[PDB]
Design a protein around this ligand. Sequence first.
Ligand code: GAA
Ligand code: GAA
Ligand code: GAA
Ligand code: GAA
Ligand code: GAA
Lengths: 103, 103, 103, 103, 103
Amino acid sequence: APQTITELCSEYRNTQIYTINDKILSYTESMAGKREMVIITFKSGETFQVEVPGSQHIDSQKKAIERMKDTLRITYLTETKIDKLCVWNNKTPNSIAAISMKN
Amino acid sequence: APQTITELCSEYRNTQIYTINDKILSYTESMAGKREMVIITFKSGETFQVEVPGSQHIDSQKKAIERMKDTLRITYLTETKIDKLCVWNNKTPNSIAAISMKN
Amino acid sequence: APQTITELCSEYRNTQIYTINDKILSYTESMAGKREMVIITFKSGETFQVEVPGSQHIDSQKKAIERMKDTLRITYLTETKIDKLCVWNNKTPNSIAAISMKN
Amino acid sequence: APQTITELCSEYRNTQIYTINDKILSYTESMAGKREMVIITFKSGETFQVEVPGSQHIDSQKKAIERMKDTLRITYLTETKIDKLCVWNNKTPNSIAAISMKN
Amino acid sequence: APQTITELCSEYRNTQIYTINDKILSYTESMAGKREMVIITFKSGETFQVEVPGSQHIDSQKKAIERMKDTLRITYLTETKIDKLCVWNNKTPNSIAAISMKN
Ligand SMILES: O=[N+]([O-])c1cccc(O[C@H]2O[C@H](CO)[C@H](O)[C@H](O)[C@H]2O)c1
Ligand SMILES: O=[N+]([O-])c1cccc(O[C@H]2O[C@H](CO)[C@H](O)[C@H](O)[C@H]2O)c1
Ligand SMILES: O=[N+]([O-])c1cccc(O[C@H]2O[C@H](CO)[C@H](O)[C@H](O)[C@H]2O)c1
Ligand SMILES: O=[N+]([O-])c1cccc(O[C@H]2O[C@H](CO)[C@H](O)[C@H](O)[C@H]2O)c1
Ligand SMILES: O=[N+]([O-])c1cccc(O[C@H]2O[C@H](CO)[C@H](O)[C@H](O)[C@H]2O)c1
């Protein structure tokens, strides 16, 4: 199994690493039908989403998507710095696949 | 997908964006039968609710409703500032569709 | 829908608003069979419970019950101050129906 | 219903109250096969456990066990004072039936 | 049941204790298909993971894996120090089987 977010990110297609090294600026959360999602933005404009579950995802991802959202909320509320993001870049805004935080 | 709360809110009928820019003055949670809901209030005078789950909600939303409540709770205890809200105004008090916190 | 706890509390018989204006003194949690419940007391000498799930509750309340417990735990933990509590007074100790915080 | 932990404890056999009045010294968690449990010790040498879910446990407790582990985890992290513990003494280490905290 | 992580660790084949005594340097989380895992790292360069739920786990382990992931996250965010950890050395990174915290 991978050691880093970078090797892990490298196993899928349509992905790339973003080096952020900054806390999240804004957090948006929606329960609107067909739009149950989460969106984060960074000071320099970058915007990422945690997509609404759907057919693209596998059953194992269902529990993982929920965990990712819980993660983004506590991180924002604590103003915790995000190191890197592994995002699928075939979606607008880009979709979050993995995240890392460094101390 | 949408990139801001405003963009998202407009995809629905009967919604309106509210610019709070202040924390939740009041928080009410209820386990009472048929009133299993949350109510929040702002110093501005405005009150908002997270509806009792019902027939008007799609399955996708069932789980998002639970998260919104979790979120409002921590937001209130943390005294986190809310940026703006997207609410259905065909309900009283107005129903919460999405939320955004900034800075 | 109600705009306030007083309002929601009034929709029930054997109900009563207690104006606390104080944080919790003690928190007791039990996982002993048939007594899976939480009890809280205050400096004023009052004691309330979040009842063990039973046939006195309709299905919609099951999720809400657990939530009340999560709310009460963290509230005690954060030394958060309670504003008011709507409770059913036909139980000993009085059973929590809803809670409000403010400030 | 029971108004205090000492009252509650008294309803079962093979139980006894341990007045700790001290924060938790160590916290141990195992996700190992059939050793899915939590262990806590205090400076006064006493050690306790929240048991692996099993035959002794009725369906209702099942949810209770989980919550209990959640409580100990946060109690440890915030260094909050446990007042008393209602434990089953027919287990080694003694088994937690109910916890109590006071501030 | 065991009373100490070490003792617990001995009960298993292919395990081994590592004395860390330090906080988590980095935390990585992935919701990508089949790589739904958590990876932790320390300043000494030690990397450990919480494996993807697979055929190697029994049903009771499934819930404990999720809890193991919650703990490492909050533990990281709170800058809490890990004392020891029992791991499976037949995987790369070594897989966490239990963790202990002190003081
Ligand atoms: O979110 N949607 O896709 C959607 C589609 C159609 C109607 C709609 O609004 C209806 O339901 C929501 C919550 O579900 C609120 O209760 C509104 O007051 C109610 O009128 C929402
Ligand atoms: O929640 N309701 O919709 C509802 C409707 C009608 C009565 C009612 O009270 C009954 O159950 C509650 C817990 O729900 C308490 O146990 C009260 O002590 C009991 O008398 C509750
Ligand atoms: O909780 N109860 O209602 C109840 C009823 C009867 C016995 C009883 O104790 C038994 O089970 C618990 C977990 O419940 C512990 O494992 C004790 O060590 C075991 O001997 C508990
Ligand atoms: O937990 N048990 O009872 C148990 C019994 C026998 C083997 C065993 O280890 C196997 O599974 C664990 C996670 O369970 C790790 O992935 C090990 O690397 C793998 O080899 C675990
Ligand atoms: O995660 N995977 O194992 C995996 C395997 C194959 C394709 C793949 O990308 C697809 O699904 C992800 C979410 O999983 C995003 O929605 C991407 O936009 C979409 O292109 C992802």
